[PDB]
Amino acid sequence: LPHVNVGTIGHVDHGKTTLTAALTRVCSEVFGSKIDSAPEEKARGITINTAHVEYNSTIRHYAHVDCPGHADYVKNMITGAAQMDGAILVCSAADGPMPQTREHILLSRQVGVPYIVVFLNKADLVAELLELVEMEVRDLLSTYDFPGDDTPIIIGSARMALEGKDDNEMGTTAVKKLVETLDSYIPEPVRAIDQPFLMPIEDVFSISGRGTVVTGRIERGIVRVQDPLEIVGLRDTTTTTCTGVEMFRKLLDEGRAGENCGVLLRGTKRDDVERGQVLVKPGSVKPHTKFTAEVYVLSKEEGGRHTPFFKGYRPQFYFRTTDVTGNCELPEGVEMVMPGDNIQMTVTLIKTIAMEDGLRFAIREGGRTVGAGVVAKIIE
């Protein structure tokens, strides 16, 4: 049973929270289906108001994210607390597309959500607008570069399905149909360990007699002895070979995603590598400096700034394991930015950093986090 991350997005009152309970029941009826004692932690940080449910189809296992408030959607989507492999946009025939519908489709594009599936809710209340409403939404999606013309759209009423109480084909059948669509349209996602090697570098040592070592926690993929590698970031890209992996004073033949270890390089001098760089499968990731980014500015209450900011904000951008200063470029008409607000900006970094579309980063003004962002489009 593969693990697919999914979630509902759309306007308010349109029935996201309802299609959520509906999905659990239709699956539980038609598809099979303890407290943590650890000591509390110091901070807490952002407060994500997020609900989670689980439900299984025949083919796969789903983890589902629903959110109370629009603001909650914005925080959760930008941070990755709610990262979806495919999202279920809920729109109603009754009311049609509304502001938070546009904002969420857009927001999904920025944050890198791969695929979007639509469920036209409240079908019970209808006729003839279903043709017209599909037309609109399809172009609405296409406006933001999702396959709006070739996108699946299921029509039904979740409240029936939940009570289901299938009256037309619009009840239980349509939710079965939605699940069937997830099974089909959203491809099985690629596990971290099946991705190209990557490890952000923390410390750099030289153990007497065995060469130079860089440590960190492997983000994705696997590194094996005698694998070629590039060191990418803050400096001109360099090549090297892995000559060993160490962990708890034991010698391993390979390091794996999730593992904290030390990697031994061939030849590379201790001064030819530093914190912030990433150890990478060659040509897998490139150095970059200018990008567009969706950002959420933390509230006063969340440890963020007590006051807004303006053009020429040059804060610190934290990418994996190090800081780098960046210039911020806001859209036209935008003068101020309020703590707790979210906006798009074009950032230009003083140094080059290893990045890809969809990389999360933190923004810091003097050590403490004051914003959280995600890379939207690489420019230079």
Binding site: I35, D36, S37, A38, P39, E40, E41, K42, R44, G45, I46, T79, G80, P200, E202, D203, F205, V213, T215, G216, R217, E246, M247, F248, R249, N260, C261, G262, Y318, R320, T321, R360, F361, A362, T369, A372
Partner: protein, 201 residues
């Protein structure tokens, strides 16, 4: 200095270490004094359990009273933090664990309070790697109870009396442990070193 090499060796071979008199008695009394000074001002509060939205004070599991420590509150603590950071770096250089930072708080168990069997690492957040506890109690004795009890490999149990100066370090993801009731006040400085997660925030 050589005492750090010991902890690093111990963690490597056994996954835990205890060292007597890890700090000098003079600094240990001042840490105990800072703990008391805080209690006297109502600055310690019931400690809770769990993370995020499900963090709750459940007094049938954990009953100590706490307050987190930061730099600049008291030189005794600044000294502690400095010792701990020397440890953090030793452990990084010798075991490559990738410890980035350190949470710690003063902890006071009133008599009768306890902490039932648990792992320090959260069920759904794996950032905690090394646990460290420093005790601050003078003239402790076996009749006072209040020992940390550790569940080691192969069914082996080990008790540690909470004696001034004593430091206990273990792998947070791997050594279940509990604190038994005591007949008198029990002061300590508990913390966790932790490694990178999946996000900065």
């Amino acid at each position: 200095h050589p005492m750090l090499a010991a902890v690093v060796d111990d963690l490597a071979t056994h996954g835990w270490s205890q060292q007597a008199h890890f700090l000098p008695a003079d600094l240990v009394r001042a840490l105990a004094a800072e703990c008391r000074r805080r209690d006297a001002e109502g600055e310690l509060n019931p400690a809770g359990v769990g993370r995020g939205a499900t963090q709750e004070v459940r007094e049938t599991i954990r009953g100590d009273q706490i307050q987190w420590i930061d730099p600049g509150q008291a030189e005794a603590c600044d000294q502690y933090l400095a010792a701990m950071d020397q440890l953090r770096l030793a452990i990084n250089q010798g075991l490559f664990l990738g410890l980035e930072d350190f949470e710690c708080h003063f902890a006071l168990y009133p008599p009768g309070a306890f902490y039932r069997r648990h792992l320090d690492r959260f069920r759904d957040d794996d950032r905690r790697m090394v646990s460290a506890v420093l005790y601050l109690n003078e003239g402790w004795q076996p009749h006072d109870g209040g020992q940390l009890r550790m569940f080691l490999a192969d069914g082996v149990e080990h008790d540690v009396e909470p004696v001034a100066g004593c430091l206990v370090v273990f792998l947070s993801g791997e050594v279940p442990h509990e604190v038994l009731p005591a007949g008198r006040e029990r002061l300590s400085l508990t913390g966790w070193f932790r490694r990178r997660g999946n996000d900065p925030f």
